[PDB]
Amino acid sequence: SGFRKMAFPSGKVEGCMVQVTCGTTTLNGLWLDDVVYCPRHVICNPNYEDLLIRKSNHNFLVQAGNVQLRVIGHSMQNCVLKLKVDTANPKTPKYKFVRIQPGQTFSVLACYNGSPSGVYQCAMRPNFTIKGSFLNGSCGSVGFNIDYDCVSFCYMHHMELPTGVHAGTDLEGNFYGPFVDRQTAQAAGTDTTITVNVLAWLYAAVINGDRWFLNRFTTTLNDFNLVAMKYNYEPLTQDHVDILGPLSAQTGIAVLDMCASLKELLQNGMNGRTILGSALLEDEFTPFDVVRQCS
């Protein structure tokens, strides 16, 4: 019982975090096999091809705990630098580089000077930002999920936008969203609420004994989506209905039955009550997140 914002255990990623310094700029890097991945900002509308051609291997100081790693090659892939080192990281886990979709969640290992400081769970927003917690020095911190023994890296941190939300890249150095790795007037666009996740969280609440918002009514997918549009919720697809199957079967509450509760909650509010300790509808838990915690 209970339901928490829960991150993956971070140890497999902690053993990969290093410090990268070029000039007077220091940030975090990710050491997997004999390559260190970090934001290309470490070499700073400049032309990064020009900036990198002017560097050599000895300009890069890579520190793994107390050991200095010798850089033997350098190259750029999109907004990430790849520094080849002379030593494979003996702590390299099984890993993949996997780009995530808006609405999916991941764990963030916030790091400063190559030293992990904290771990928390984030969702990729529909507008391709994350609501992270990052201070100066956090560039190069990574986001990930873990399946069995395999770390799927999905995010490297680059930027804070004017509203205080965050923007970054996949591990191929391609930005999530229409953002760049320099100071411009760029700003997050309008966001929307992740409907399938709200429904998953309502199922988590039922599994944990919160039932006050349930009702006898069912709705049609079409009539639900008309209400979703009015409150800035994403339309519900049949694929989303399908992915909620397991939770619907465990609770005995049909997906379109739960949709009628959500419609009522949007129209009427909570009337001073809470669900799973929240006074708002939470949209940062996926159906998989719920199944993992509410087994």
Ligand X SMILES: *C(=O)c1ccc2ccccc2n1
Q: Which does 263 bind (CB under 5 to 8 A by kind): its own copies, ligand X, none?
A: none
Looking at residue 65, its amino acid is G
Do the strands 94-97 and 105-112 form a parallel or antiparallel pair, or are they unpaired?
Answer: unpaired
Check the CA dihedral 31-8-197-190 and report its sign. negative
CB 32 within 8 A of CB 64: no
Of 98 and 270, CB closest to its own copies: 270
Q: Which residue, 129, 103, 131, 105, is CA-closest to 235? A: 103
Q: Which does 133 bind (CB under 5 to 8 A by kind): its own copies, ligand X, none?
A: its own copies
Contacts with ligand X, residue ranges (CB under 6 A):
27, 39, 41, 139-140, 158-159, 181-183
Q: Which does 182 bind (CB under 5 to 8 A by kind): ligand X, its own copies, none?
A: ligand X
Instruction: Examine the residue annotation and report whether 139 is marked as an active-site residue of this protein.
Output: yes
Q: Which does 65 bind (CB under 5 to 8 A by kind): ligand X, its own copies, none?
A: none
Query: Binding mask 84-123 vs its own copies (x if CB under 8 A, - otherwise)?
Result: -------------------------xx-----xxxxxxx-
Instruction: Examine the residue annotation and report whether 166 is marked as an active-site residue of this protein.
Output: no
Among 15, 102, 235, 246, binds its own copies (CB under 8 A): 15
Check the CA dihedral 223-228-229-235 and report its sign. negative
Residue 242 C-alpha from the chain's centroid? 23
DSSP 262: H
Distance CA 156, CA 232 (A): 29
Q: Is residue 260 close enough to count as binding its own copies by CB under 8 A?
A: no
SS3 268: helix
Which helix (H) or strand (E) covers residue 16, if one does? none
Q: Is residue 271 close enough to count as binding its own copies by CB under 8 A?
A: no
Q: Which does 37 bind (CB under 5 to 8 A by kind): its own copies, ligand X, none?
A: none
Of 5 and 230, CB closest to its own copies: 5
Tell me which of 22, 38, 41, 111 is the catalytic residue.
41
* Nearest residue to ligand X, scored by beta-carbon proximity: 139
CB 176 within 8 A of CB 170: yes
Distance CA 36, CA 28 (A): 10
Which residues are catalytically annotated? 41, 139
Q: Which residues bind its own copies (CB under 8 A)?
A: 1-12, 14-15, 109-110, 116-122, 131-135, 160, 164-166, 208-209, 274, 277-280, 292-293, 295
